[PDB]
Amino acid sequence: MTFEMLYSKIHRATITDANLNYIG
Amino acid sequence: MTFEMLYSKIHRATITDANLNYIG
Amino acid sequence: MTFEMLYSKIHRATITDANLNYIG
Amino acid sequence: MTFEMLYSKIHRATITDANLNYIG
Amino acid sequence: XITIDEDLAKLAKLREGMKVEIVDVNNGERFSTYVILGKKRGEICVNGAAARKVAIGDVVIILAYASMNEDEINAHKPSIVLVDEKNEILEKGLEH
Amino acid sequence: XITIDEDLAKLAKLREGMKVEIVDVNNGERFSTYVILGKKRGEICVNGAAARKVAIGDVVIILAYASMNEDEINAHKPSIVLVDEKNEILEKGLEH
Amino acid sequence: XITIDEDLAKLAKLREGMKVEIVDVNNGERFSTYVILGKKRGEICVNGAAARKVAIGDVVIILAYASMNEDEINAHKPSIVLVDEKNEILEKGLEH
Amino acid sequence: XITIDEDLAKLAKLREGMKVEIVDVNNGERFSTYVILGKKRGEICVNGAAARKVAIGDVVIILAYASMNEDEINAHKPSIVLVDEKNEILEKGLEH
């Protein structure tokens, strides 16, 4: 039996950029 | 082969507080 | 390595009732 | 311990058709 | 949650408490919940918060997924059940 | 995230850091987060971005799922806990 | 559900019935469904309730995830397939 | 997808291609995507359809979950990383 557990987290980081039509 | 099964549940509890900018 | 695979499905069934404040 | 990892992806494909009332 | 006719659930190999995905054809809502075996024939009742995601009379698709390894995948055969407006079985195929 | 009274969490066999599904009966919102053991009695606090998905005073259902094999399923018994408006335990059944 | 050109699916190592995440670049919708191997060349058809989440002609990204252990992760190589407006293969990389 | 400063990702023990949950504090959006190791310092770039779920400058929480058995759970210690407005590390705790 397994359960999904919080492994790690980056708290309150800031989005510095966004790319809707990213390729890759 | 495994299946996600209801393990436990707290039914109809009341939210006593909310913290949008929580830190931790 | 495992993958989530369609195990079974009930196609186009009709909702006969709804209970928002169900208890159980 | 296991983690969901990107196995494969089809990038920027075009939807050629849609069938709301599909049967099967 | 979703109470399903135990006889219908059995045909789809659903177990009580098994997580299932519900997709509403009428309104397009997609959500997850768990199976509750019903005693009423042809009954499909959405309980709890999910009631707000559907309307009585909507057509829905109930799906169950399982985590399989490569060998299980090759030998796997999905249970696809089709029902009528009364939730009576019309077909049960073992292929897409 | 969601801070739950450690005493309440224990009854539902929730572990700190365990992923749980939250469904809000008032507004119908459905989201996932993880459990944080609270020290305040009867406390249920939603932290982070999830705060925007609920209102203080809303009634919610907290669910925990586990991946089981067929044998575990047959021997499995879910912990269903029902509470009152004060998040005090009313019942704890081992069946649906 | 989503019917994908079996020849395209093969290149992405998708199996029929395999759960996949669909993200629509045009409208931002994100949903899950399963793969159905198509017989029509360059075909990508969304079936069922999901049809309400897309429009014919939208650009989408189809993703498949697998649960791996640390060793599998280190040896793992994702299959990234890029196609053109006709869903014809342009590239198939084994890295990001 | 989300390109994360490889140096930041490492601190959170994120692997390239690892599925992660993104929650936007500003707008409340919650979605899943995978990690791409970035080469630019302090960079956090959302790529693909997900770009429509965020705005440059939004504060987000990036979470990674793993499926563990009871023994792994008892010995498990989460990596909680807190950063500043420049995505520079402020703290990295091994507890909640």
Swiss-Prot record, chains A, B, C, D:
Superkingdom: Bacteria
Signal peptide positions on this chain: none
Record protein name field: Aspartate 1-decarboxylase beta chain
Full-protein positions shown: 1 to 24 of 117
